[PDB]
Amino acid sequence: RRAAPLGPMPNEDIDVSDLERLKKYRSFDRYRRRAEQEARKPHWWRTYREHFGEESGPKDRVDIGLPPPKVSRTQQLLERKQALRELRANVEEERAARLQTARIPLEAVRAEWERTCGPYHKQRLAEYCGLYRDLFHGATFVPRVPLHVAYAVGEDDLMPVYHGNEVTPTEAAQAPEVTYEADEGSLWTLLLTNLDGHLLEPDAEYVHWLVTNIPGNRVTEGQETCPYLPPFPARGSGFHRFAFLLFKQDKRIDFSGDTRPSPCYQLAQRTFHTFDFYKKHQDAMTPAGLAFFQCRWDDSVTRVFHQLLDMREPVFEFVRPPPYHPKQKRFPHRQPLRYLDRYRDSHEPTYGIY
Amino acid sequence: LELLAVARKERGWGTVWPSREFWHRLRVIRTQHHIEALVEHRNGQVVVSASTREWAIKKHLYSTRNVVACESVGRVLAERCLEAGINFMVYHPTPWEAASDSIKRLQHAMTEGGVVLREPRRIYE
Amino acid sequence: SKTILVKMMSQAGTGFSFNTKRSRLREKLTLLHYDPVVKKKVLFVEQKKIRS
Amino acid sequence: YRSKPTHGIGRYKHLVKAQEPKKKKGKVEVRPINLGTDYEYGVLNIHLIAYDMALAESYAQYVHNLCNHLAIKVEESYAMPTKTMEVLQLQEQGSKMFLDAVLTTHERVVQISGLSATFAEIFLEIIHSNLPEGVKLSVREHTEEDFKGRFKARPELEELLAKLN
RNA sequence: UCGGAGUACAAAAAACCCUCCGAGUGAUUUUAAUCUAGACAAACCAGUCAAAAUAACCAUAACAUCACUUAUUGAUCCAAAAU
RNA sequence: GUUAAUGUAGCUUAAAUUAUCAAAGCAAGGCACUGAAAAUGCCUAGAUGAGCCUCACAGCUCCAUAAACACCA
Ligand SMILES: [K+]
Ligand SMILES: [Mg+2]
Ligand SMILES: [Mg+2]
Numbered sequence: 001r002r003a004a005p006l007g008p009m010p011n012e013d014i015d016v017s018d019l020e021r022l023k024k025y026r027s028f029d030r031y032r033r034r035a036e037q038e039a040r041k042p043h044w045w046r047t048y049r050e051h052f053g054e055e056s057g058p059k060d061r062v063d064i065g066l067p068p069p070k071v072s073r074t075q076q077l078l079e080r081k082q083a084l085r086e087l088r089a090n091v092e093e094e095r096a097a098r099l100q101t102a103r104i105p106l107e108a109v110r111a112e113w114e115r116t117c118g119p120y121h122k123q124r125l126a127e128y129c130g131l132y133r134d135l136f137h138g139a140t141f142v143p144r145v146p147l148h149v150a151y152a153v154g155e156d157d158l159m160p161v162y163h164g165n166e167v168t169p170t171e172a173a174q175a176p177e178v179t180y181e182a183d184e185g186s187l188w189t190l191l192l193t194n195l196d197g198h199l200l201e202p203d204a205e206y207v208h209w210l211v212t213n214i215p216g217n218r219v220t221e222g223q224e225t226c227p228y229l230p231p232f233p234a235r236g237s238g239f240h241r242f243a244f245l246l247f248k249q250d251k252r253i254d255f256s257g258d259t260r261p262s263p264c265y266q267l268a269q270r271t272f273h274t275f276d277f278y279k280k281h282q283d284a285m286t287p288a289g290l291a292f293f294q295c296r297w298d299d300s301v302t303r304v305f306h307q308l309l310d311m312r313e314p315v316f317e318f319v320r321p322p323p324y325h326p327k328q329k330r331f332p333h334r335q336p337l338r339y340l341d342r343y344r345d346s347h348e349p350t351y352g353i354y
Numbered sequence: 355l356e357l358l359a360v361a362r363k364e365r366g367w368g369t370v371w372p373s374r375e376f377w378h379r380l381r382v383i384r385t386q387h388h389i390e391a392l393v394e395h396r397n398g399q400v401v402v403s404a405s406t407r408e409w410a411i412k413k414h415l416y417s418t419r420n421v422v423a424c425e426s427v428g429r430v431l432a433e434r435c436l437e438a439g440i441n442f443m444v445y446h447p448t449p450w451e452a453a454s455d456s457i458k459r460l461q462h463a464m465t466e467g468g469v470v471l472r473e474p475r476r477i478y479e
Numbered sequence: 480s481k482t483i484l485v486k487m488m489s490q491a492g493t494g495f496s497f498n499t500k501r502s503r504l505r506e507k508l509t510l511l512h513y514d515p516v517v518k519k520k521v522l523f524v525e526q527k528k529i530r531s
Numbered sequence: 532y533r534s535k536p537t538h539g540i541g542r543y544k545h546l547v548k549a550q551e552p553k554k555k556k557g558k559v560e561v562r563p564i565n566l567g568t569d570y571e572y573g574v575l576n577i578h579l580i581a582y583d584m585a586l587a588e589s590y591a592q593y594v595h596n597l598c599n600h601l602a603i604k605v606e607e608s609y610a611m612p613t614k615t616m617e618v619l620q621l622q623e624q625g626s627k628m629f630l631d632a633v634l635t636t637h638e639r640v641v642q643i644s645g646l647s648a649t650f651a652e653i654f655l656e657i658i659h660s661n662l663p664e665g666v667k668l669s670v671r672e673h674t675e676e677d678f679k680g681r682f683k684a685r686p687e688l689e690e691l692l693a694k695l696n
Numbered sequence: 697u698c699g700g701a702g703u704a705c706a707a708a709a710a711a712c713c714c715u716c717c718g719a720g721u722g723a724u725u726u727u728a729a730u731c732u733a734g735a736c737a738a739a740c741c742a743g744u745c746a747a748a749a750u751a752a753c754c755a756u757a758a759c760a761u762c763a764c765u766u767a768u769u770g771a772u773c774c775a776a777a778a779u
Numbered sequence: 780g781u782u783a784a785u786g787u788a789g790c791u792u793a794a795a796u797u798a799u800c801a802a803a804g805c806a807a808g809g810c811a812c813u814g815a816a817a818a819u820g821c822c823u824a825g826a827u828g829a830g831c832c833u834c835a836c837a838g839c840u841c842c843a844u845a846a847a848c849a850c851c852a
């Protein structure tokens with residue numbers, strides 16, 4: 001009983017007759033490009049993307065962030081081409097390019113990458129690590145303003161904190177310094193939170209730093225709300241994610257309801273909900289920057305639990321599910337002698353009445 | 355789980371190519387005009403990408419379809435992967451691309467760039 | 480054309496013999512097998528003819 | 532499965548040709564010579580003959596590549612066996628000859644399929660206009676006699692054929 | 697006796713002194729280990745796959761390949777050989 | 780001069796200071812690679828018709844392409 005397909009068949013567009021007229025592929029790298037483009041379309045039949053967690057497929061992402069800068073494409077198109085012609089005409093560049101002997105100023109590219117496409121590349125990094133899922137749920141923001149976080153480790157050594165980096169707690173024992181370009185006409189809010197690491201509640205996150213009403217670039221001159229606390233990931237469960245959030249606020253806002261005590265060491269007072277926190281001051285603040293790093297356990301974590309938190313250090317361990325075995329039959333058929341060992345409770349022999 | 359080398363790798367396939375048993379895959383596409391290098395998760399998403407189509411890299415290179423252009427793409431992507439914390443990835447090149455001059459020297463930039471191929475073996479695979 | 484079955488003894492001194500089918504017109508065979516006794520690959524040489 | 536709407540999604544044998552394998556006993560160049568369509572000429576052979584190997588092949592490649600751009604089917608791009616002639620000049624104040632030089636001839640043939648009657652004027656116009664230097668263009672029909680020169684000679688049959696006659 | 701196609705049209709099974717092809721081994725070297733979760737198959741005896749783990753060697757290396765690859769085979773007892 | 784169709788590269792994407800990271804993809808070429816093609820490696824050339832309008836939607840107009848009334852032996 002043949003049924004009718006629910007939509008167009010894949011290869012029905014091409015004509016079966018007159019095969020020689022149709023141009024062939026002639027290559028294997030063309031087919032891979034064609035196959036991959038075909039594999040991402042929403043077919044009406046069952047596909048791999050449907051069963052293996054495509055994260056609800058198309059999602060209407062809510063955008064809560066600064067508008068993109070206004071740039072004139074007409075002027076930009078001409079100047080970009082004009083700059084390229086000057087570099088193209090250089091004969092010495094052709095001498096190096098042909099002889100396969102040339103390098104590029106990676107630092108110069110780093111500066112320009114941040115200004116041009118840095119915010120968009122950092123957006124998918126946060127989405128990949130699920131920062132938006134655990135902070136604003138479905139809502140997302142574009143890190144428009146660049147943000148730099150660095151830790152003072154040695155006398156002059158400076159450990160940077162990029163998007164998705166890895167920092168040992170020893171480097172993060174002291175408070176970091178934040179540098180960003182902003183004019184003295186607005187205010188900023190800095191927030192450092194431990195997305196995972198809350199003990200009692202799994203859906204809450206700790207707060208390690210909170211500076212309110214920062215005048216321009218100078219972070220120190222801003223009002224301080226929650227003092228810095230070194231990261232304290234558990235020994236068993238490693239790689240906790242710590243995120244720096246930068247908020248741009250129009251008016252001086254009364255951030256007194258979230259004030260924490262000065263030598264704050266009660267973890268029950270560090271309980272935080274960024275979505276709830278941003279809900280109260282949604283009108284005033286607006287996320288503008290982002291920088292997050294991974295952090296695992298080290299020796300410097302131990303003293304935090306003992307000296308600072310006055311806490312016994314908890315140690316976890318990765319426990320796998322027990323192996324699966326079938327129901328034991330009274331007379332196993334064509335089974336090895338080790339069939340009894342699978343269902344043994346302990347290897348110590350147990351005597352009964354004897 | 356990915357950083358602890360305990361997450362599940364999508365073992366299987368074998369009758370198709372490339373094998374999808376990885377955490378991160380390096381996807382290098384050589385169009386006739388531009389060179390694009392991608393780092394992809396097994397979910398299909400792209401994490402970090404460095405391509406000559408970017409204006410940041412375009413204004414520093416002479417041409418976007420040279421052997422030198424592949425080196426610049428490799429070096430820029432290697433820096434970004436370190437900034438993104440991705441230190442291990444799997445690259446499955448086409449056999450003729452493995453002997454190509456550009457791809458051979460592109461991996462040399464990755465090795466000296468700090469990013470190491472050959473992702474670590476899963477613990478209790 | 481008939482093949483011959485020969486027993487090969489390890490040259491590592493340990494007593495380990497595995498049989499291998501060999502063509503009759505071929506000369507004495509010498510392979511590189513892997514005896515579990517030494518847990519290392521060692522030379523094996525043809526010793527005796529058992530079955531044709 | 533038959534009853535499922537996704538039946539026949541894996542069909543591919545109708546995309547590629549049958550590609551009959553060259554059987555050991557059935558190996559034969561079975562060419563169905565087409566002759567006299569309404570607007571399609573028969574199979575033609577573009578015989579390019581020149582004294583220099585490099586020049587003859589260079590123009591042979593141009594003809595083959597031009598056909599592909601013009602959607603002209605090319606059945607084969609074989610090469611006729613070369614012929615060598617011993618050039619002997621006469622000696623002045625005498626009659627006995629002397630070996631002057633050894634000149635050879637090289638022939639390259641690009642067999643083409645049928646073409647529209649209108650395109651015959653246009654296609655040949657490009658060819659004869661681009662004859663570089665001394666290349667003897669010869670566009671003749673693909674008869675079996677013109678294709679017999681590629682094979683060898685069989686005196687064993689000629690011994691029988693002579694006695695048969 | 698053993699395998700492949702049809703009879704047996706779409707999961708499995710399914711007969712005839714039914715219709716047609718084969719097998720009772722060669723060629724080559726990549727000479728192919730030990731140990732164990734879970735299963736297919738099956739009256740029984742037999743047959744098949746196989747993660748993890750250990751050793752071997754790119755120092756985090758296990759499918760011998762090709763010939764329609766599917767069949768290329770024989771239970772105890774007993775006898776001979778180093779065990 | 781006048782009457783009716785059209786004008787990102789060869790086709791075509793984004794774009795068209797409507798916003799965005801950006802003028803894209805495939806074709807088309809040179810050289811090397813058993814002799815032809817084809818693959819592969821290396822490598823070359825580049826357009827947003829023109830102005831105005833709108834400056835935060837995009838279209839009108841101009842010019843040109845091109846047909847027509849229509850100069851022609
Ligand atoms: K947690
Ligand atoms: Mg069963
Ligand atoms: Mg294994």
Ligand SMILES: [Mg+2]
Nearest residue numbers: 771772773774
């Ligand atoms: Mg008995």
Ligand SMILES: [Mg+2]
Nearest residue numbers: 592815816817
């Ligand atoms: Mg060629």
